[PDB]
């Protein structure tokens with residue numbers, strides 16, 4: 001929940017996910033990608049389920065980064081959808097979609113799909 | 122495209138997407154799904170490219186809904202990733218990922234994928 | 244069903260899907276893409292549910308194309324996963340994944356996602 | 366080039382068993398046994414791979430499909446995997462997959478699951 005999700009996370013690519021979870025389900029923070037058309041930190045915002053099920057399952061969440069900041073614009077956005085899994089070694093397991101702006105002729109090739117797993121080390 | 126994106130949108134399922142695009146690149150609003158384990162409106166937040174290319178390319182954006190509100194909690198979240206296409210028939214074309222909370226044994230089946238197209242036509 | 248799926252199908256991009264459905268679940272045929280790094284016809288192979296439910300549901304199916312023929316090699320492959328929906332205007336509704344060969348450091352950007360709907364027209 | 370490398374018996378992180386033969390000009394044929402889901406024993410699979418991959422260290426593109434009907438069960442669904450075979454000291458197949466099951470048109474929006482499987486020859 002709030003304290004478990006709040007903090008600094010790293011995925012398998014070395015990217016840095018700094019996030020604050022609110023009591024009301026909000027996610028806010030910054031994202032630093034180690035790959036792609038990206039430099040420094042980007043704003044992120046998202047939502048999480050603030051009252052998850054009581055059977056040991058994960059906590060559903062998602063967030064968005066638009067890849068524009070003061071240093072670069074990649075004309076694109078990524079959303080991550082996944083679940084937070086608490087425990088001795090907490091994890092956030094996600095799938096993501098990255099859309100970049102295209103003409104309509106090229107819309108068919110506008111979206112990349114992948115998967116990221118975040119840990120606290 | 123603050124003026125363009127801001128407003129009330131409907132997808133091909135009849136779901137209602139009410140959104141304000143702010144100066145900073147923020148999207149805020151509410152989502153009401155016509156389908157699924159959902160009732161009434163849900164908070165949404167997201168981001169968009171506030172300085173898109175002017176060469177006919179769409180405007181990249183995305184947003185998230187956690188499916189908990191005052192009526193129901195479906196223990197799930199959807200993110201939409203897409204682009205806004207201006208013109209006489211403005212459109213937001215998206216693909217989405219819906220994840221629901223699972224045990225680790227069942228996490229292989231935790232995520233649905235699909236696509237929604239939105240217009241301002243009621 | 245066999246005769247339902249067998250034939251020539253077109254998607255919203257203008258691509259041509261020529262398929263034969265065998266009695267025990269086989270799909271074989273050729274694909275011609277109207278877009279991308281492709282020219283002429285490519286071999287496809289797939290599988291479909293040869294005993295679908297008779298409760299109004301679609302018929303699940305999928306197929307793969309590797310983008311190599313005698314004209315060209317694009318070092319990539321696409322898989323389509325969807326369902327055949329019968330009736331007056333038959334349709335095949337799919338989502339697809341296109342993976343191209345990358346180095347391990349670039350594997351994160353290796354796979355595109357999209358959706359194609361096939362009908363008998365165009 | 367990767368004909369012999371791809372050919373063999375593979376396992377993913379769920380414990381599923383992927384037995385495949387790669388033909389010299391791009392065909393994949395074999396069987397798939399899922400450790401999870403509405404599945405029992407082996408299912409037929411067919412697919413394609415790039416039989417002439419690029420040189421500068423790129424992986425080899427491939428994909429395959431399983432329809433989840435065999436002599437034991439019919440789950441009225443199909444999965445496609447799309448990914449890359451990577452060589453090296455320990456060969457791996459990294460995939461993303463789409464599982465579609467038959468629905469009514471009213472429910473077509475919830476018809477497709479997405480996930481990812483990584484295969485190796487160990488276990």
Ligand SMILES: Cc1ccc(CNCCNC(=O)CCCC[C@@H]2SC[C@@H]3NC(=O)N[C@@H]32)nc1
Nearest residue numbers: 013015033035036037038067074076078096100
């Ligand atoms: C022909 C053609 C034309 C245009 C493009 C755009 N190409 C995408 C550009 N936009 C970025 O590169 C933004 C950074 C994304 C980083 C991802 S986000 C998901 C994953 N997880 C991480 O931590 N980093 C990665 N392509 C091909």
Ligand SMILES: Cc1ccc(CNCCNC(=O)CCCC[C@@H]2SC[C@@H]3NC(=O)N[C@@H]32)nc1
Nearest residue numbers: 134136154156157158159188195197199217221
């Ligand atoms: C075996 C199994 C177990 C659990 C579930 C949960 N099943 C998802 C539950 N959560 C919802 O049902 C929330 C509403 C989502 C509405 C979607 S969001 C994307 C699309 N676009 C729209 O406008 N509405 C739809 N399943 C299968």
Ligand SMILES: Cc1ccc(CNCCNC(=O)CCCC[C@@H]2SC[C@@H]3NC(=O)N[C@@H]32)nc1
Nearest residue numbers: 256258276278279280281310317319321343359
């Ligand atoms: C930055 C970067 C680097 C490398 C690549 C390679 N990229 C390989 C492209 N490989 C092809 O272009 C083959 C044809 C696929 C056509 C698709 S298949 C799915 C959809 N549906 C249709 O009918 N046609 C389309 N890219 C971007």
Ligand SMILES: Cc1ccc(CNCCNC(=O)CCCC[C@@H]2SC[C@@H]3NC(=O)N[C@@H]32)nc1
Nearest residue numbers: 379381399401402403404433440442444466482
């Ligand atoms: C709400 C709702 C309604 C209907 C269904 C049907 N649900 C389709 C079931 N069809 C199977 O269960 C076949 C086995 C799939 C195994 C997968 S294939 C991809 C992954 N990788 C592996 O090795 N095994 C797994 N659901 C939810």
Ligand SMILES: [Br-]
Nearest residue numbers: 036037074100
């Ligand atoms: Br790029």
Ligand SMILES: [Br-]
Nearest residue numbers: 157158195221
């Ligand atoms: Br549900």
Ligand SMILES: [Br-]
Nearest residue numbers: 279280317343
């Ligand atoms: Br390309």
Ligand SMILES: [Br-]
Nearest residue numbers: 402403440466
């Ligand atoms: Br099932």
Ligand SMILES: [Mn+2]
Nearest residue numbers: 109279343355
């Ligand atoms: Mn490409």
Ligand SMILES: [Mn+2]
Nearest residue numbers: 230464466478
């Ligand atoms: Mn299922």
Ligand SMILES: [Mn+2]
Nearest residue numbers: 036100112352
């Ligand atoms: Mn790219």
Ligand SMILES: [Mn+2]
Nearest residue numbers: 219221233475
């Ligand atoms: Mn569901």
